Design an enzyme around this catalytic site. Structure first.
Site, PDB file in Angstrom:
ATOM      1  CG  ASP A  25      23.625  -0.941   5.326  1.00  0.00           C
ATOM      2  OD1 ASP A  25      23.002  -0.741   4.266  1.00  0.00           O
ATOM      3  OD2 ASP A  25      24.866  -1.043   5.387  1.00  0.00           O
ATOM      4  CB  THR A  26      17.961  -0.885   3.072  1.00  0.00           C
ATOM      5  OG1 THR A  26      18.658   0.177   2.413  1.00  0.00           O
ATOM      6  CG2 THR A  26      16.968  -0.301   4.073  1.00  0.00           C
ATOM      7  N   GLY A  27      21.085  -1.960   2.573  1.00  0.00           N
ATOM      8  CA  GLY A  27      21.986  -2.512   1.578  1.00  0.00           C
ATOM      9  C   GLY A  27      22.782  -3.687   2.126  1.00  0.00           C
TER      10      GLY A  27
HETATM   11  C1  LIG Z   1      26.732  -2.150  -0.535  1.00  0.00           C
HETATM   12  C2  LIG Z   1      27.186  -3.576  -0.805  1.00  0.00           C
HETATM   13  C3  LIG Z   1      28.421  -3.565  -1.688  1.00  0.00           C
HETATM   14  C4  LIG Z   1      27.559  -4.305   0.487  1.00  0.00           C
HETATM   15  C5  LIG Z   1      26.594  -4.101   1.643  1.00  0.00           C
HETATM   16  N1  LIG Z   1      27.422  -3.379   2.639  1.00  0.00           N
HETATM   17  C6  LIG Z   1      26.417  -2.415   3.111  1.00  0.00           C
HETATM   18  C7  LIG Z   1      26.675  -0.989   2.602  1.00  0.00           C
HETATM   19  O1  LIG Z   1      25.587  -0.149   2.993  1.00  0.00           O
HETATM   20  C8  LIG Z   1      27.997  -0.425   3.157  1.00  0.00           C
HETATM   21  C9  LIG Z   1      27.982  -0.450   4.700  1.00  0.00           C
HETATM   22  C10 LIG Z   1      29.028   0.449   5.325  1.00  0.00           C
HETATM   23  C11 LIG Z   1      30.380   0.082   5.351  1.00  0.00           C
HETATM   24  C12 LIG Z   1      31.345   0.955   5.826  1.00  0.00           C
HETATM   25  C13 LIG Z   1      30.967   2.206   6.279  1.00  0.00           C
HETATM   26  C14 LIG Z   1      29.634   2.583   6.276  1.00  0.00           C
HETATM   27  C15 LIG Z   1      28.677   1.711   5.802  1.00  0.00           C
HETATM   28  O2  LIG Z   1      31.924   3.118   6.673  1.00  0.00           O
HETATM   29  C16 LIG Z   1      32.322   3.846   5.503  1.00  0.00           C
HETATM   30  C17 LIG Z   1      31.360   5.015   5.186  1.00  0.00           C
HETATM   31  C18 LIG Z   1      31.253   5.343   3.696  1.00  0.00           C
HETATM   32  C19 LIG Z   1      30.104   4.653   2.982  1.00  0.00           C
HETATM   33  O3  LIG Z   1      28.947   5.071   3.109  1.00  0.00           O
HETATM   34  N2  LIG Z   1      30.409   3.556   2.287  1.00  0.00           N
HETATM   35  C20 LIG Z   1      29.368   2.795   1.550  1.00  0.00           C
HETATM   36  C21 LIG Z   1      29.547   2.951   0.020  1.00  0.00           C
HETATM   37  C22 LIG Z   1      28.590   2.056  -0.735  1.00  0.00           C
HETATM   38  C23 LIG Z   1      29.322   4.410  -0.389  1.00  0.00           C
HETATM   39  C24 LIG Z   1      29.273   1.305   1.934  1.00  0.00           C
HETATM   40  O4  LIG Z   1      30.128   0.490   1.543  1.00  0.00           O
HETATM   41  N3  LIG Z   1      28.218   0.964   2.682  1.00  0.00           N
HETATM   42  S1  LIG Z   1      28.600  -4.194   3.460  1.00  0.00           S
HETATM   43  O5  LIG Z   1      29.783  -4.289   2.617  1.00  0.00           O
HETATM   44  O6  LIG Z   1      28.942  -3.447   4.673  1.00  0.00           O
HETATM   45  C25 LIG Z   1      28.087  -5.708   3.919  1.00  0.00           C
HETATM   46  C26 LIG Z   1      28.328  -6.820   3.114  1.00  0.00           C
HETATM   47  C27 LIG Z   1      27.899  -8.089   3.502  1.00  0.00           C
HETATM   48  C28 LIG Z   1      27.225  -8.255   4.712  1.00  0.00           C
HETATM   49  C29 LIG Z   1      26.979  -7.154   5.526  1.00  0.00           C
HETATM   50  C30 LIG Z   1      27.413  -5.889   5.132  1.00  0.00           C
END
Ligand SMILES: CC(C)CCN(C[C@@H](O)[C@@H]1Cc2ccc(cc2)OCCCC(=O)N[C@@H](C(C)C)C(=O)N1)S(=O)(=O)c1ccccc1
Lengths: 99, 99
Positions: A25-27
């Site tokens: 996860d690059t995000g």
């Molecule tokens: C992005 C920003 C705000 C926050 C960084 N985060 C990483 C993202 O890629 C998150 C990671 C993630 C979380 C939950 C999941 C799947 C992946 O199950 C749900 C599947 C649906 C989905 O794809 N949900 C996306 C949504 C943006 C469309 C999402 O929230 N993706 S995080 O909240 O998980 C964090 C925050 C702080 C430290 C580590 C991770």
């Protein structure tokens, strides 16, 4: 390797002697692992995402093997719906985004 | 281009004729943009993340330019902490993860 994004980029990681499936996860700034009994000292902390914040336990210098690549760093453990490998560990295995 | 991950992968995008900054997030299934006015109809939808679910406005077939590259697809608008370009648009610009 080269991973396409038609599907979630899930790979096998090894942490605490256990094999798991985690999302590259690059995000994610940090690495978040689903609840597990890792020994060691930890510090509490709150991380937030879409939906709000959750409480997690921060573990430092934990060895993690990502698709055969060795890494070591901070791992947050808590009630996440999925194991997340963040930038802190991706940089260590030399992962890049290309387009 | 080739983007390393020591820093958040933030890039400039153009949507609705406006310029904005967004995170290239391989961990996001969908693209979620902060509240703004986008022309066209929209449908209520809910999406979930680390801290639970939120309500968003779903906009279909929206043109979005990501670092000079064009994509046309679904964009969700709602209360997100940051603008996120998810896999639905990343696959359109041929983005891959490499290591
Ligand atoms: C992005 C920003 C705000 C926050 C960084 N985060 C990483 C993202 O890629 C998150 C990671 C993630 C979380 C939950 C999941 C799947 C992946 O199950 C749900 C599947 C649906 C989905 O794809 N949900 C996306 C949504 C943006 C469309 C999402 O929230 N993706 S995080 O909240 O998980 C964090 C925050 C702080 C430290 C580590 C991770």
């Amino acid at each position: 390797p080269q991973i396409t994004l038609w599907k979630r980029p899930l790979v096998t990681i090894r942490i605490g002697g256990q094999l798991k499936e985690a999302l590259l996860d690059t995000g994610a700034d940090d690495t978040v692992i689903e609840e597990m009994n890792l020994p060691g000292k930890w510090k509490p902390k709150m991380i937030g995402g879409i939906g709000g914040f959750i409480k997690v336990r921060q573990y430092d210098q934990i060895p993690v093997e990502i698709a055969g690549h060795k890494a070591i760093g901070t791992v947050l453990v808590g009630p996440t719906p999925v194991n997340i490998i963040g930038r802190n560990l991706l940089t260590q295995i030399g992962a890049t985004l290309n387009f």
